[PDB]
Design a protein around this ligand. Structure first.
Ligand SMILES: [N]C(=O)C1=[C][N+]([C]2O[C]([C]OP(=O)([O-])OP([O])(=O)O[C][C]3O[C](N4[C]=NC5=C4N=[C]N=C5[N])[C]([O])[C]3[O])[C]([O])[C]2[O])=[C][C]=C1N1=[C]C(I)=[C][N]1
Ligand code: NAD
Ligand code: CL
Ligand code: ZN
Ligand code: ZN
Ligand code: ZN
Ligand code: ZN
Lengths: 374, 374
């Protein structure tokens, strides 16, 4: 079959920034001890993959991007015990090693084995498993899912329900868990509260769902693209506003609309201005502002400390606060039990080969979550 | 009786910024409905009072400062149901109107009837009560305690135990509650956690106490004034560090000795550089940084939101997060229950008239909490 042997498959390689994805033939090496080789079934296009392409997120190039996915274990390396071939799995962009200070803390999830802080672009052992034209290709967030087959560390993969529809549940790999957890875990939206969500893509809309689920009484959705309004309202938004319709700065508008400011603001775009407006629109005395969007590299915000002194809370989080390996499978169970649906988010489905077309949809703002099938 | 009549007394008025306080004769008009005229018995010198003197905190001048205090109800206005003459009381720089959005929210205390956000220098009805040489003198934070008599709104005054040593219990009026509550109420320091406290003035030392009461395992006290360490140690600090002894940045020094960073850091000074170090020294994935120090006017920080995205929580609070009308007396009760001691804080006791000498000791750093008696 393929276990123990090198696999030669297709992968979308980014050789340089601001350049189209090149579909190459790569050699995927067999998994070492404590690694799992996965056969991809469905991958979602997260903006963070785009952040690398536009040059806003730095990470070693050439590289195989992708981190929102679902697939089947092709083989496991010696030592692997949490999963076996044929198992349906979801690769996790933030591992859960279970040994570190962070992992052993019940309230934090940014595991110390991540590759976000200082991007080595390798697996946890400091080595790569891809080769294209003889040249070694870097991994992204230790998942590199834009490939027919990838190898990830064991603590970076979760075994999910065998009955899970992979083309739906892959969104739980990032988009959904990130947005839903931001509301539910990170901010911890109280019942009867008012929330404002800035940005309405797959992640932001999921944040709307999580606010709805938290029992928020009012959910104001903000986006400059009005086409997103139908979905937003459908998912729980009590009202949607377009900053371009006003002469006043977005935060004053919200302050006036909510008797002084929302209780929870969510920045789910990744811009300095929306991050500021987001902190500004929540009530000075009892507002919590949560940053979900990923900021452009080495950009700084100028903030007057007095904004926080009155009683505001500013915080950010990766993966919606979910301890990865432990939390994702549970969200899949919730999906199976029909606790929430992912159908409104998936607007486009294309074959992996059309990956570039997928990104064009994101750029045009015509798509929410686009899924690539292998 | 003096009730109904205008009281003529001595008060430390400030006419110009950065000039000595003038002990003059002012006229304290009688309390209007819902107001209380209090006879000051002991006022403490809080660093914020100094901020107005130095120009760091802007407020209308002329003004009678002072807010950390205790006294006896001289007389009450019409409709006053919470206090009666003779009742030992404590004025609150932040009131608890009890009927506003912030007051109805259990997790917040910045009552909308405060005079910090936008200083008017008046009592809640928009008018002044003091006069000096034919001119009206402004109030400060609605309290104005550097006067033998003062008039405060009912919701900005709390009655305490009719046996409380007002010469000590006055620290609960600001300094102690602010620091203590910041650890207990705002950070919500967890048992076995590791904390860092930048600034060992009366408020920092109080935070140390609160960090120990919460059951922190390590309390690293940071200060350039070496003479504070003995007190810090005495109050619970596991170790004291002086930034000047190092050739390396204090934040780095602190991360290196706490395996990545502390769990809860507190900035209890009011400088931007210290507020930055304080944010930087708490673990990037599970650290909560709390701002206690009132920063200088108009100055603001430059931060990379990536500092928050990984898991950090940044918040600030006034009055240690305590809802003034309810928390202050409760605190006194605990003091009355001998649960804590303010003796280690009060380092100098001066007669009201020696007020300028008080601020001199504060500027020299050879004092923690100086009390002025009447
Ligand atoms: N934290 C975490 O974890 C995360 C994050 N993230 C981020 O977030 C963001 C967003 O996402 P998305 O959803 O995917 O995207 P999109 O689709 O693109 O959306 C966007 C939106 O928004 C809007 N806008 C823009 N601009 C504007 C707006 N609104 C308003 N205003 C303005 N100006 C548009 O229209 C649309 O709708 C980003 O940043 C991302 O990145 C994600 C995820 C998660 N992670 C982490 C990771 I290292 C990976 N991932
Ligand atoms: N948030 C509030 O409710 C609230 C309440 C009371 C006071 N405050 C503010 O908290 C701050 C301090 O209060 P305080 O009464 O304890 O003041 P304080 O001046 O007596 O204490 C300042 C301490 O900081 C130390 N310090 C100064 N620069 C330092 C540095 N660069 N590095 C390390 N240590 C340094 C000084 O040696 C001193 O020990 C002030 O801004 C005060 O206005 C805020
Ligand atoms: Cl007047
Ligand atoms: Zn993502
Ligand atoms: Zn870990
Ligand atoms: Zn109020
Ligand atoms: Zn004070």
């Amino acid at each position: 079959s393929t276990a123990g042997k090198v696999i030669k498959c297709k992968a979308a390689v980014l050789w340089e920034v601001k350049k189209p994805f090149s579909i190459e033939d790569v050699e995927v090496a067999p998994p070492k001890a404590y690694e799992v080789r996965i056969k991809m079934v469905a991958v979602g296009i997260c903006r963070t993959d785009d952040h690398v392409v536009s040059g806003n997120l730095v990470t070693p190039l050439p590289v195989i991007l992708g981190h929102e996915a679902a697939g089947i274990v092709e083989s496991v390396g010696e030592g692997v015990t949490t999963v076996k071939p044929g198992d349906k799995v979801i690769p996790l962009f933030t591992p859960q090693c279970g040994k570190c200070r962070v992992c052993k803390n019940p309230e934090s999830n940014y595991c110390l084995k991540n590759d976000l802080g200082n991007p080595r672009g390798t697996l946890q052992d400091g080595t790569r498993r891809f080769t294209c034209r003889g040249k070694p290709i870097h991994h992204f967030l230790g998942t590199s899912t834009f490939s027919q087959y990838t190898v990830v560390d064991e603590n970076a993969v979760a075994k999910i329900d065998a009955a899970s529809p992979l083309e739906k549940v892959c969104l739980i790999g990032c988009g959904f868990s990130t947005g839903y957890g931001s509301a539910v875990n990170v901010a911890k939206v109280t019942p009867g509260s008012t929330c404002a969500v800035f940005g309405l893509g797959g992640v932001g809309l999921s944040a709307v769902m999580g606010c709805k689920a938290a029992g928020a009484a009012r959910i104001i959705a903000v986006d400059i693209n009005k086409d997103k309004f139908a979905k937003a309202k459908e998912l729980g938004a009590t009202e949607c506003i377009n900053p371009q319709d006003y002469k006043k700065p977005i935060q004053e508008v919200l302050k006036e609309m909510t008797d002084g400011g929302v209780d929870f603001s969510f920045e789910v775009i990744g811009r300095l201005d929306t991050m500021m407006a987001s902190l500004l629109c929540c009530h000075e005395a009892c507002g919590t502002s949560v940053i979900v969007g990923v900021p452009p590299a080495s950009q700084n915000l100028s903030i007057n400390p007095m904004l926080l002194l009155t009683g505001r809370t500013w915080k950010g989080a990766v993966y919606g606060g979910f301890k990865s390996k432990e939390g994702i499978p549970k969200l899949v169970a919730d999906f199976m039990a029909k606790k929430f649906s992912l159908d409104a988010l998936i607007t486009h489905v294309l074959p992996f080969e059309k990956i570039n077309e997928g990104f064009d949809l994101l750029h045009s703002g015509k798509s929410i979550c686009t899924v690539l099938t292998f």
